[PDB]
Design a binder for this molecule. Sequence first.
Ligand SMILES: O=C1CC=CN1Cc1cccc(-c2ccsc2)c1
Length: 188
Amino acid sequence: AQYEDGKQYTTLEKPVAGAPQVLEFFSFFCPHCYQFEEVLHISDNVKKKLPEGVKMTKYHVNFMGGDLGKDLTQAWAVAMALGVEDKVTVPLFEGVQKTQTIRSASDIRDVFINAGIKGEEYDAAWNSFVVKSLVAQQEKAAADVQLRGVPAMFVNGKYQLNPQGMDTSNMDVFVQQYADTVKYLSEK
Ligand SMILES: O=C1CC=CN1Cc1cccc(-c2ccsc2)c1
């Protein structure tokens, strides 16, 4: 067929009940994730093609970058809680991988301050149990699929995107193939 299990996607042998409809994982340490988000704009182009009533969830992971990797999962929880993902995603990626100016939790915080989140607001969120809960939700979702690599995207707890089964000669074509595959999977 045009879409084939093992080609554009794979099928989880242990399906996850109650999983987010479309679930993306990344790390700000992850070089391919930098490409996915900053250059390919995968999340945006996937979202722009999702059926009505299909929501997209994006979570950070701990298994890259040690201590700072865990700090970034907590900062991503702050970003989600405050709803400022679209303000901090670029400077966090660039801070970690382009300028390499993010070396500590304080450096992460500076990115939010520069993006206009007030210091008191950031610190209250950082220390909040709402954010602890969001951190737990990120960890649980990744654990549910035994996640050991990023970038990764899952659909309905059942299917995992397989971008290695896609032509990478043209960036634009690759992105819409990925997006069309997520749409196809969500409609299964
Ligand atoms: O996910 C995959 C599979 C193979 C490579 N990658 C990562 C990547 C990074 C940056 C650009 C491309 C790309 C896609 C079409 S033209 C250039 C692909």
